[PDB]
Amino acid sequence: NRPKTYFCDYDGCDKAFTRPSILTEHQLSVHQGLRAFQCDKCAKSFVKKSHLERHLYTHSDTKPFQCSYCGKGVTTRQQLKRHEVTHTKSFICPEEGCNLRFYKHPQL
């Protein structure tokens, strides 16, 4: 919506941003080499609250997305969708007019 009208000034940086706090998040993270959210359970650190929140689940068994078929736990919707698509007849015969459909790619 609103136009990108805050330009990073550093040598060899191309980026422009919508609102000045975001330009500052970029500058402190990329160019100065500082981060604002530390893991309690390992050495790593993160640039956003949502990124530390994802990393915190990785230290735990009670992972926040749970499979509808097998009940395996995962941390975000992309992982869930890819995993659940393995519980489907995903693959299709690529050859002309052939009707068949398959569950594991080596079968196809």
Interface residues with DNA (CB under 7 A)?
Answer: 1, 4, 15, 18, 26, 29-30, 44, 46-48, 50-51, 54-55, 58, 72, 74-76, 78-79, 82-83, 85-86, 90, 105-106
Looking at the Cβ atoms of 3 and 22, the one nearer to Zn ion is: 22
Please, how many CA atoms are within 13 Å of residue 10, restricted to the half-sphere of its CB? 12
Min separation Cβ 11 and DNA, Å: 16
Binding partner selected for residue 29 from Zn ion, DNA, none, CB under the kind-specific 5 to 8 Å limit: DNA
Q: How far apart are CA 80 and CA 96, in angstroms?
A: 32
DSSP character string of 66-89:
E-SSS--EESSHHHHHHHHHHTS-
